[PDB]
Amino acid sequence: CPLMVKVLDAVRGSPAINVAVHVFRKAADDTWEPFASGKTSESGELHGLTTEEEFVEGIYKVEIDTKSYWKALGISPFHEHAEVVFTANDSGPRRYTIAALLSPYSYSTTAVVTNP
Amino acid sequence: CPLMVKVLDAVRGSPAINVAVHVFRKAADDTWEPFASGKTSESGELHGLTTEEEFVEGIYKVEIDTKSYWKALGISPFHEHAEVVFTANDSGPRRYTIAALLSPYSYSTTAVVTNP
Amino acid sequence: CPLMVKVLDAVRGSPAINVAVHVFRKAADDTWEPFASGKTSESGELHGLTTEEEFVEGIYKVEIDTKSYWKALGISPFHEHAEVVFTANDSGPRRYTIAALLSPYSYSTTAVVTNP
Amino acid sequence: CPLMVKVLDAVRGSPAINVAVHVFRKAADDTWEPFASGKTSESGELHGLTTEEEFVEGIYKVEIDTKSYWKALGISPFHEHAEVVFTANDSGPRRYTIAALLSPYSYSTTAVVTNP
Ligand SMILES: Oc1c(Br)c(Br)c(Br)c(Br)c1Br
Numbered sequence: 001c002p003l004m005v006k007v008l009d010a011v012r013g014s015p016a017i018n019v020a021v022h023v024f025r026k027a028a029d030d031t032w033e034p035f036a037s038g039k040t041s042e043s044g045e046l047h048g049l050t051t052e053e054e055f056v057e058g059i060y061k062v063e064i065d066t067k068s069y070w071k072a073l074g075i076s077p078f079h080e081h082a083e084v085v086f087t088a089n090d091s092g093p094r095r096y097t098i099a100a101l102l103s104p105y106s107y108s109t110t111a112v113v114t115n116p
Numbered sequence: 117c118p119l120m121v122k123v124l125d126a127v128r129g130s131p132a133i134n135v136a137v138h139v140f141r142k143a144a145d146d147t148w149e150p151f152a153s154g155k156t157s158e159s160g161e162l163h164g165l166t167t168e169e170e171f172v173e174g175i176y177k178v179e180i181d182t183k184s185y186w187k188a189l190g191i192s193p194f195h196e197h198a199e200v201v202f203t204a205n206d207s208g209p210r211r212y213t214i215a216a217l218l219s220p221y222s223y224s225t226t227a228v229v230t231n232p
Numbered sequence: 233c234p235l236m237v238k239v240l241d242a243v244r245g246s247p248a249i250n251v252a253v254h255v256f257r258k259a260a261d262d263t264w265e266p267f268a269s270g271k272t273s274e275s276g277e278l279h280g281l282t283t284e285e286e287f288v289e290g291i292y293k294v295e296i297d298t299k300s301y302w303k304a305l306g307i308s309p310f311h312e313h314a315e316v317v318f319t320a321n322d323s324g325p326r327r328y329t330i331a332a333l334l335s336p337y338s339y340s341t342t343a344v345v346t347n348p
Numbered sequence: 349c350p351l352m353v354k355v356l357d358a359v360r361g362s363p364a365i366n367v368a369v370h371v372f373r374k375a376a377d378d379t380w381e382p383f384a385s386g387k388t389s390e391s392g393e394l395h396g397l398t399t400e401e402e403f404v405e406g407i408y409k410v411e412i413d414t415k416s417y418w419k420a421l422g423i424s425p426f427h428e429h430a431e432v433v434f435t436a437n438d439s440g441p442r443r444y445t446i447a448a449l450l451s452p453y454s455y456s457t458t459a460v461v462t463n464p
């Protein structure tokens with residue numbers, strides 16, 4: 001899988017488990033079309049969202065439902081979610097790991113991109 | 117002004133100057149409607165985006181044009197922009213400072229909410 | 233004052249108030265000698281640590297007592313403290329702002345160096 | 349191995365390869381004694397620093413040589429290194445992953461702690 005998402009909880013110092021993640025791709029008509037979704041595992045990771053064949057060149061958006069994650073832990077966070085928007089595979093296929101480091105009032109997101 | 121944005125450049129170690137910032141408010145149609153905008157100053161700050169009278173409760177999105185910023189510096193960026201989506205609530209501190217720390221392939225955004 | 237520290241709390245989304253900060257300067261014996269110290273204000277800032285006359289080139293260490301801060305809030309922390317070690321250089325901007333963004337199991341520190 | 353270090357480059361969006369890492373443990377006499385060292389792999393990871401038997405309860409310091417990393421890339425960074433100081437195994441053996449996200453003038457470090 002060319003697209004992987006990893007979510008970590010900066011309060012507990014652990015993977016953020018069962019976090020919903022939705023991926024969209026900008027369509028020719030400039031609207032966000034559903035592309036893939038899933039939930040993070042016990043390791044805070046989400047694999048198998050797509051394939052090299054399906055993951056074509058385009059602008060993508062990964063929305064991580066951080067609000068539900070914090071609310072489930074008894075915390076009312078600042079952000080509705082964490083959304084990562086980026087152009088992918090414009091110079092050929094690449095492997096993308098989208099990491100998100102979560103705190104109730106702050107989050108960091110990083111992309112580690114490597115060749116297939 | 118109850119809403120301010122501050123942006124920093126983690127590569128140069130300085131305020132991120134002249135970064136375009138657009139604020140949107142979610143409408144009944146669930147669409148994003150332009151609310152306020154501007155460019156960060158020499159101190160990397162943007163104030164005077166709104167007033168207490170106009171800044172009512174609701175869902176807001178702050179989009180920071182990080183791609184144009186890195187492009188101007190000749191550094192290849194990953195993200196199209198940095199979006200901060202949140203719900204403004206009156207039963208909470210009155211002033212919101214959205215700080216964004218930028219790196220070409222990584223960014224963090226934090227909300228510092230305080231009283232006047 | 234050419235050196236200032238600002239600390240934020242990523243859990244509460246506010247300035248980190250009353251955090252102990254100690255500055256050390258590396259001596260010829262390669263040991264750390266106390267240089268300046270204080271506690272962050274209600275705005276999470278610490279200024280007036282030194283003067284331009286005293287702040288000569290050399291290696292400095294800023295230690296932020298993050299453990300005592302989280303302990304006071306009843307949240308189990310990971311780090312003993314946050315250390316920022318750097319070389320001050322005259323052939324570079326004159327003012328240093330060391331910002332630290334705190335989470336119980338994660339922290340980021342950034343240097344914003346500017347001219348007067 | 350109960351102690352792993354992962355280093356990422358936030359400018360290139362890739363693992364930070366060949367980064368020197370030194371680990372120390374506070375001795376009964378309150379000085380930092382050498383404990384283990386190594387360099388990050390092509391994946392930005394450093395495994396095999398210690399064992400469950402050797403990694404006893406104590407205060408540890410992981411110093412990541414970020415300066416040499418940036419200098420080798422033609423960049424003069426702010427920090428001399430990134431040092432993570434923490435108490436380990438005080439409630440029994442744990443597995444620690446110390447992650448460091450690097451930028452020339454900023455760095456973030458997070459600890460993901462899990463049971464053996
Ligand atoms: O003033 C700030 C600076 Br400078 C940095 Br860097 C960060 Br991160 C945050 Br949050 C604030 Br508020």
Ligand SMILES: Oc1c(Br)c(Br)c(Br)c(Br)c1Br
Nearest residue numbers: 008099101110356447449458
């Ligand atoms: O594996 C990672 C972990 Br763990 C953390 Br924390 C961060 Br930040 C990043 Br980027 C990666 Br990739």
